[PDB]
Amino acid sequence: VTGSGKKPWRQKGTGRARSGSIKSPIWRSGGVTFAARPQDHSQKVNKKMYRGALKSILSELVRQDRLIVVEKFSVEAPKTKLLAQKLKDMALEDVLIITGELDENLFLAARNLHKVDVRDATGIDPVSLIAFDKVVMTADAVKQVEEMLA
Amino acid sequence: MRLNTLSPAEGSKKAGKRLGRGIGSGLGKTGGRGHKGQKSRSGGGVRR
Amino acid sequence: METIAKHRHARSSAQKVRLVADLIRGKKVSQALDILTYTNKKAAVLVKKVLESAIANAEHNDGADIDDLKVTKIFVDEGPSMKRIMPRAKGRADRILKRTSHITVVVSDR
Amino acid sequence: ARVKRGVIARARHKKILKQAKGYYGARSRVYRVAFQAVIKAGQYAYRDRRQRKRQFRQLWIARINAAARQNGISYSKFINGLKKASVEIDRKILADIAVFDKVAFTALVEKAKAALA
Amino acid sequence: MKTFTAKPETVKRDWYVVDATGKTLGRLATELARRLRGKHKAEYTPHVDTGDYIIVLNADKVAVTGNKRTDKVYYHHTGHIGGIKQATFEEMIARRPERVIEIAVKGMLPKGPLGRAMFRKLKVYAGNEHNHAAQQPQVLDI
Amino acid sequence: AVQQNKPTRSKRGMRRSHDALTAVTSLSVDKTSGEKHLRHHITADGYYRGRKVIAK
Amino acid sequence: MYAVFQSGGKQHRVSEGQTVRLEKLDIATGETVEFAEVLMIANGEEVKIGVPFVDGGVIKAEVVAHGRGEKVKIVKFRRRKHYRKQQGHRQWFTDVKITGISA
RNA sequence: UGUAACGGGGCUAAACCAUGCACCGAAGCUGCGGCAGCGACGCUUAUGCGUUGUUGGGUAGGGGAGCGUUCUGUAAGCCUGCGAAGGUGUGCUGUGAGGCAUGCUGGAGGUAUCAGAAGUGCGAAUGCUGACAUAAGUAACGAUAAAGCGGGUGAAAAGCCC
RNA sequence: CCCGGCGAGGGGAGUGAAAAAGAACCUGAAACCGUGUACGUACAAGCAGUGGGAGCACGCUUAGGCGUGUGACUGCGUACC
Ligand SMILES: [Mg+2]
Ligand SMILES: [Mg+2]
Ligand SMILES: [Mg+2]
Ligand SMILES: [Mg+2]
Ligand SMILES: [Mg+2]
Ligand SMILES: [Mg+2]
Ligand SMILES: [Mg+2]
Ligand SMILES: [Mg+2]
Ligand SMILES: [Mg+2]
Ligand SMILES: [Mg+2]
Ligand SMILES: [Mg+2]
Ligand SMILES: [Mg+2]
Ligand SMILES: [Mg+2]
Ligand SMILES: [Mg+2]
Ligand SMILES: [Mg+2]
Ligand SMILES: [Mg+2]
Ligand SMILES: [Mg+2]
Ligand SMILES: [Mg+2]
Ligand SMILES: [Mg+2]
Ligand SMILES: [Mg+2]
Ligand SMILES: [Mg+2]
Ligand SMILES: [Mg+2]
Ligand SMILES: [Mg+2]
Ligand SMILES: [Mg+2]
Ligand SMILES: [Mg+2]
Ligand SMILES: [Mg+2]
Ligand SMILES: [Mg+2]
Ligand SMILES: [Mg+2]
Ligand SMILES: [Mg+2]
């Protein structure tokens, strides 16, 4: 805290509680007793615990009928309207689309759709696999996730 | 399975103690340090 | 009907005006003015000008018969204090509070 | 995550000052004093749920004594008499009857006397 | 159902007259105190005066045992420094004999407002005559 | 010397139980000028017991 | 006419039509309870004193309500010993209405 | 300092010794209702329930189970101008920390649930800042060189002007 | 527009959804100070409550010896850290 190290008043004689620093955390305008510092909140996750978690997730999706497999999933042009349309026809709304390789059109077409995310098999994550009603995977995506989870 | 239906294993996130928060808590006032002497002080205690 | 007048931020402690407010609470306004006229108190000058304002408010605004009015309510509340400092002996300073008051007078024919 | 305490603290003080209604002076106005007043109130109250059972029995006895002596026998002998007669009416009820049914109380005295005779 | 309590506004308080002639002071006083408190009534109520009005005649003939006539001492203090005062029983009886029975009964009545009220129902006289025939006191051999 | 304990608002009010003012009860009306006035005092226009005693 | 009986470790003096609050009875509302050990029956100068119970004496009553009483606060406080606690308590009760005193 | 060496009154027993029977008397014991800890076993254990013995004063201190506050996700969801937060009442409910409902005030925000992270709970530290009491309408109004009157100005004049 | 010193301050009018936004201006807690009503209080002694409890006032239920406020009298009772 800004200010000086001057004792605000003499130790004895005035009848005030003894003081020592104008920046005492007891004091208004004083320092914060256990002031905060930037901290790194990340945690280690054991590799095996990571893959195991993914496996359990995928297995519930299946068991809850939230996992949907298809041969192909793409759109003909980077137009949000086309994806939206496809999704309506498939009776999908809130959905994670996971494909084998990145698909650019599909990615762009999906970006402004808040209930939709697109992802290549390599980039899946645990919270995405949970956070959407359905998850659609192409055969290739399955074949790649499988390889990934040994 | 949703982001608001996941919970930790029973017993895996025990709550930390918080000293000095009143009679009911059981760790009020002296905070489990007893009365007086070196060990009751901030920074107080003897070396290994 | 009831008609109000007030003097807010009057320069007197509420205590001093209350001595006077008490003299006239409940009285016919004519007897109240006589009482105030011959009460030798600064606060009697203050309260009289408020009562007179209430009387004129009642006649001018509310169509009242001044013959029929009574001081049905009168109360003095505490205003903001002005804070000052008075030097005393040996370098010591004392607080001075210059207290003020809010004077409310209500008149009515009932 | 800075936490401000006003809403919680205010509810806490108000809960105490509300229990201090009727108390004199700072006891019903000033938290620090009200709090100590409310505690002492509970202490006495705890104590006096036990005492209440003592004072009432002490009252019943005293009245039974009076009504017994009016019929010519002392409380202590009257009680002994009833015990020997296998009468089990307790002292709350006996004190009620002493006041409200003087003729039944006398009949109870005659039952006590007989069992002592 | 709450236990009965007597009520100041409906309490019945009867009048009696007692002769102190020859009675042992403190054994008379306990009975007077009993009856002035209501202890003898089934309606006895510790916060209510349920007792009776009692006239005591011939206070000047009250009796005491042992050597207390000449030796029992009444002490009192005037509130002024050094002002401790005393009289024997026998001096009390010759100066105001009523005081003997009154002092004895008052010590045996509760302390505080109600007990002071209970005392007001005691009318003690030195001689054989009272002026309360209007109250029709009933003879009480106590 | 100073208090060991804070006097109560009750006590303050008891202390003040003699502080109230008295209203004047003895006004008269001059019979010639019609003015009110303290008894045994002249009126504002300078009348007393019915005579104009002070031109002012 | 009144009668005296024991219920809930306590005794009660009652007449017909009276509602009286007892310790909780495991009897459903609208059922009739019988108290067949009655300590005293008195009707107008006739007075039956049980020794301990009156022969053929029955008090009939109807269960009218079950409920919990007003809360009572328990406070414990040991001054200067850094100790205090409270507890709140409500007591169960059954109300019965006396419908017949059979002497 | 004042009875002041029965707590008092008073007592010749209302004292002392002996025998006896009665009664009063505690948060101890019993009775009725209820909660919980530890066991045990049951109608029947996915784990709490149901029976059932017993235990349940407590400082320092160890252990266990919880309430509530702020922020992140759940949440582009749910409540909310047909009234959010906060303020003030009331009713019900929880063993309690608390919760929910609702009248009035207010006028734009709030956030179930399950998780996640803490600047997370105050009556004391001659604590810190602000606000307001008290003494009290008390002391004081600063050199004891000194004022009096007429007239004026002014809403008002002991104090300003002549 | 009105009282007031061509004041301070106020009462009307009008603006505004609102002046229960009037410039000391959102919300407007608490200490602290008042006006009004109900009940208590001038023979009475102490941590100011708690247990019992009359009476009064105010609601009930349509009576039932119940809610709320007050609290004569009475048992017990020397604050917190
Ligand atoms: Mg800072
Ligand atoms: Mg790695
Ligand atoms: Mg920690
Ligand atoms: Mg310490
Ligand atoms: Mg030590
Ligand atoms: Mg140590
Ligand atoms: Mg200087
Ligand atoms: Mg209050
Ligand atoms: Mg105690
Ligand atoms: Mg006593
Ligand atoms: Mg003696
Ligand atoms: Mg013996
Ligand atoms: Mg007991
Ligand atoms: Mg026990
Ligand atoms: Mg908030
Ligand atoms: Mg909320
Ligand atoms: Mg949480
Ligand atoms: Mg503390
Ligand atoms: Mg003084
Ligand atoms: Mg002086
Ligand atoms: Mg002076
Ligand atoms: Mg000067
Ligand atoms: Mg002026
Ligand atoms: Mg103006
Ligand atoms: Mg309009
Ligand atoms: Mg207006
Ligand atoms: Mg405001
Ligand atoms: Mg009186
Ligand atoms: Mg006193």
Side-chain angles (χ1 to χ4, degrees), chain E residues 5-26:
Chain E
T5 178
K7 276 153 195 184
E9 291 289 312
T10 64
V11 170
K12 175 78 172 314
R13 302 196 184 98
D14 310 287
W15 276 77
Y16 299 84
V17 59
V18 166
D19 185 354
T21 295
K23 316 283 223 286
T24 300
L25 175 59

Side-chain angles (χ1 to χ4, degrees), chain A residues 46-121:
Chain A
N46 293 7
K47 293 188 199 183
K48 272 169 190 167
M49 294 187 60
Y50 174 83
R51 300 199 276 265
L54 287 201
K55 289 178 174 180
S56 273
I57 291 174
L58 292 170
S59 289
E60 273 287 308
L61 289 173
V62 169
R63 181 181 302 118
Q64 289 314 312
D65 278 71
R66 292 169 63 182
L67 177 63
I68 309 300
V69 191
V70 298
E71 262 312 305
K72 245 62 165 188
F73 195 116
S74 199
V75 294
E76 201 150 321
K79 304 253 72 187
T80 317
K81 175 188 260 254
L82 290 178
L83 173 57
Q85 185 59 48
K86 181 183 240 289
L87 292 182
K88 190 202 212 182
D89 292 350
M90 297 179 155
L92 305 177
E93 205 200 302
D94 188 79
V95 60
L96 173 77
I97 312 300
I98 302 163
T99 178
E101 296 307 297
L102 176 86
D103 186 327
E104 196 53 29
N105 295 358
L106 184 57
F107 171 77
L108 288 169
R111 197 158 57 174
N112 219 33
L113 300 191
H114 174 257
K115 297 148 140 41
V116 181
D117 196 13
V118 184
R119 208 72 71 92
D120 81 327

Side-chain angles (χ1 to χ4, degrees), chain G residues 3-22:
Chain G
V4 177
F5 76 100
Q6 173 132 330
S7 183
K10 302 173 268 297
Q11 301 183 8
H12 322 267
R13 187 160 84 90
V14 300
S15 316
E16 301 181 324
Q18 222 185 299
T19 298
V20 60
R21 171 159 298 172
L22 310 178

